[PDB]
Amino acid sequence: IANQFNSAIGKIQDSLSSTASALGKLQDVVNQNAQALNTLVKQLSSNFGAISSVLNDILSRLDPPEAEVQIDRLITGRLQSLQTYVTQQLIRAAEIRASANLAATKMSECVLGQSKRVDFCGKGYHLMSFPQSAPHGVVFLHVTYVPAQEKNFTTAPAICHDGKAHFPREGVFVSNGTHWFVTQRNFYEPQIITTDNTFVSGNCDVVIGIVNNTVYDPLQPELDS
Amino acid sequence: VSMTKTSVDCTMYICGDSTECSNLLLQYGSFCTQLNRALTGIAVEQDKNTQEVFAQVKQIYKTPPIKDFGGFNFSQILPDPSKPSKRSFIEDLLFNKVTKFNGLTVLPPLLTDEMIAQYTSALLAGTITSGWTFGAGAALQIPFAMQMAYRFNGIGVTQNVLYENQKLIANQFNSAIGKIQDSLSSTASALGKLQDVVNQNAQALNTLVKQLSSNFGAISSVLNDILSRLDPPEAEVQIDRLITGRLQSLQTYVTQQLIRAAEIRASANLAATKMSECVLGQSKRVDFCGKGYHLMSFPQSAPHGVVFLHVTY
Amino acid sequence: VTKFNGLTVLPPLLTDEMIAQY
Amino acid sequence: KNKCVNFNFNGLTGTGVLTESNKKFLPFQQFGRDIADTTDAVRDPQTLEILDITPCSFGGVSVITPGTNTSNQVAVLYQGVNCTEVPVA
Amino acid sequence: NVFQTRAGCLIGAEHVNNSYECDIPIGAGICASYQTSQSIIAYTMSLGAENSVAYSNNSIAIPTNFTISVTTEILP
Amino acid sequence: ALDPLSETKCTLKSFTVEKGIYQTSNFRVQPTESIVRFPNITNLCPFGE
């Protein structure tokens, strides 16, 4: 686990260094603001129906009663430009505030503690995460537990020994073709079937697919010794 | 999940087939540019919702030819190969209950319905075989009797109940699925949440078209009449009135679409969260996957959305 | 990852250093 | 130069700071402008040289005050204004 | 190279029956990409390889190995 | 126009001001004088022609 983890962190440095587009999510916020600011400014050069876009010009062109007619067109149009800008900023602000609440939620479940949610901290079973500062944002490196290799085994829902169905207390029953072993779902660790690893409920005539085997009782050799 | 994709042309909408009206529109700058960029971003986000929601997996999963479901009947939830298009018996009902020349263009969806059914089929086929594993990692074969046994052990129910009452759990479940089919077939309002999306889009488009007939203080709403009647200097006055108002009409449309764009994306994020917690895995949250202790869910495709059938204890 | 018409840019309440110290 | 003034060059009117510029213009080149289509530089008609145009300093005024029940002492903040530009007030 | 689709008439793209991963999205499940003498081509967007998972009552697999992965997530 | 504190009350339209920072009338630098640079011109208009 020391090599897998350290080797994983190395790939993060190579990916972020080689691939500059992984941060495009943040670059969009910069581009959207640049277009809004650039556009908002360029609207000053527009006539908006007026003879010219320069205020001192119209005041230095039309007479006082005639100028006000044209000046109103610039004020009217330029006014709508601000409304369009403010309207978009309020809407875009909702998308950022929604992301901020999401980032604050992840740090609580992912970073601070351990999250049991499915794929909330990223694919696989979440362990812990590393918060990292990013411009106008934040980066989360999530360490997860991903199973790799598996092997097909024979299983049975229950074991029958003395006539009472035996069920696993934890894990599942597996067999290599000879003896039935107890093992966890996430890894293969053969364990002998014992009364401590199984529970007694019902009989053998109910469970469907129950099989017969020898349940080892650790108390037998103790009583004989 | 997804909302209708619309592309409004602010060159034709404002000035129909008019050179003079067009020149007068250029004096207003980038207004026509902004209206296109805003609607363009919406169409992209509408399709982006399907990518974050419908597709939870990079692999296609299929069921074996021999069906042992452990007493449950999935014939209703799984696609029917005998139909001309791939869909299940439930999706068949979901699609049936839910259903211009002025420069309004309806863009096609990025994801076809047939490809949506393949997403659900992969999720359904996985839960039948791989259980909760395929979403958390490589597909891991598990027997069904073992699948339900673990799902009960997680909610505090010792698996003794499953193996002993398996016959009873098979009758309650199968009878429950039958009630879903009867309810969806008889009740057409269950999808009304999806019908609202269609009604709102039609209302916005209908209004946007009707605004063209408004005078906006002009002598006549037809540009050809203004040009065929008034002199060039007098026509500019009447054309400016029509353009000014038609600009406000487009600003009203885009404003409403941006607001609804934030609503549809919020719903899509919720759908993606449920598929992760409720469908792929088992969630311990209270009343997130539905009342009772959540066992597992069946994703089902619906028009411009998705349906979740939550099996609870 | 990276005017004269009266548009003002407000400085952030917290410097890039403070967010790094969190 | 180096001061806020109202400049008129061959009919080009505006208010801003005028300074010497290392920016080069072509012989026919006189009135330039920035991305905002506002003149950022000009050539003096009589004597030929390039002048950099910057808008005179401006910004908001924020008042830092405690509660009225506390005291009337106030501190004024000049947004984006250098200390040497305050006396202009 | 004049073909018709549900989105409209597309000129300058060759139709390849083989399904690949979407590169340039178009519509109606159609995408374009630059590949093999290379030129633009049109194809249906593939959902990935078809994986048929064996299923049986007595068959189960226990993962024999694991891998620690580090996922990178960014938020504004 | 009295002092900055009054400008705060004047901005908030209230005779009581709670602790905090508030924005007031913006500051702007005015020009020191007018600059006029024109080319040399002498002869009268062609009133003869």
The residues near B102 (Cβ < 8 Å, ≥ 6 apart) are B12, B13, B209, B212
Contact between A151 and E61 (Cβ < 8 Å): yes
Whether E74 and A133 have beta carbons less than 8 Å apart is answered as no
- What tokens does A47 get? 């006539």
Question: Is A33 part of the contact surface with chain E (CB cutoff 8 Å)?
Answer: no
Residues 6+ apart with CB under 8 A from A221: none
Are E69 and A96 a contacting pair, CB within 8 Å? no
Under 8 Å CB-to-CB from B82, ≥6 apart: which residues?
none
Our measurement of the distance from residue A193's CA atom to the centroid of its chain's CA atoms, rounded to an integer in Å, reads: 39
A114 and A128 Cβ atoms separated by less than 8 Å: yes
| Of D38, D59, D60, Cβ closest to residue C4 | D38
> Interface partners of B (3+ CB pairs, < 8 Å)?
A, E
- Alpha-carbon gap, residue B303 to B299, rounded angstroms: 13
Residue with tokens 């003498």: E37
* CA distance to partner chain D, nearest, from residue C3 (Å): 9
Q: 């006000």: which residue's tokens?
A: A68
DSSP E6-75: SS-EEES-EE-SS-B--SEEEETTEEEEEE---EEEEEEBP---EEE----SSEEEEE--EEEEEEEEEE
Structure obtained using: cryo-EM
Amino acid at A183: T
* β-bridge pairing E50-52 and E59-63: unpaired
Tell me D85's DSSP state. Answer: G
For chain A, how far is it from start to end, CA to CA, in angstroms? 43
Shortest CA gap D26–chain F (Å): 20
Which residue is closest to C1 within chain A, CA to CA?
Answer: A27
Could you give the CA distance from residue B300 to residue B76 in angstroms, rounded to a whole number?
11
Q: Rounded CA gap, E41 and E46, in Å? A: 15
Contacts of B255 in chain A (CB under 8 A): 87
Taking the C-alpha atoms of residue B219 and residue A49, their distance in angstroms, rounded to an integer, is 19
Triad B247, B252, B254: Cα angle to 5°: 95
PDB resolution in Å: 3.4
Alpha-carbon distance of A173 to A167, in angstroms, equals 9
Cα–Cα distance for residue pair B47/B57, rounded to 1 Å = 17
Q: Residue written as tokens 């001192």?
A: A56
Instruction: Name the residue facing C5 among D36, D40, D79 (closest C-beta).
Output: D36
**Neighboring chains of E (3 or more beta-carbon pairs < 8 A):** A, B
CB-CB under 8 Å, C2 with A44: no
Q: Are D40 and C8 in contact (CB under 8 A)?
A: no
Cβ neighbours, 10 Å, residue F8: 22
Using the Cα atoms of residue A32, residue A37, residue A40 and residue A41 in order, give the sign of their dihedral: negative
CA dist., res. B161 & res. B31, Å (int): 67
Length of chain D counted residue by residue? 89
Interface contact flag, B115 E58, Cβ < 8 Å: no
* Pair D17, D3: CB distance under 8 Å: yes
Give every strand in the sheet of D50-54, ordered side by side.
D41-43, D50-54, D12-20, D4-9, F34-37
Are the C-beta atoms of residues B103 and B12 closer than 8 Å to each other?
Answer: yes
CA proximity to F5, closest of D80, D76, D88, D89: D76
Residue spans of alpha helices (H) in A107-170:
none
Q: Is D41 on the interface with F (CB under 8 A)?
A: no
Phi, psi of B27 (to 5 degrees): -65, -20
CB contact under 8 A, B159 and A167: yes
Phi, psi of A29 (to 5 degrees): -60, -35
CA atoms within 13 A on the CB side of A163: 0
Neighbouring C-beta atoms of residue F4, cutoff 10 Å: 17
- Indicate the DSSP class of residue B1: -
Q: Which residues from chain A sit within 8 angstroms of residue B273, using beta carbons?
A: 120
Listed residue (D33, D32, D1) closest to D16, CA to CA: D1
Question: Residue B255: which of A87, A117, A167 has the nearest Cβ?
Answer: A87
Instruction: Report whether A25 contacts E76 (CB < 8 A).
Output: yes
A149 closest CA partner among A107, A188, A120, A192: A188
Euclidean distance between CA atoms B272 and B304, whole angstroms:
14
Contact call for E72 and A99, based on CB within 8 A: no
| Chain A CB within 8 Å of residue B59 CB | no
**Going by DSSP bridges, is the β-strand pair E30-35/E39-44 parallel, antiparallel, or unpaired?**
antiparallel
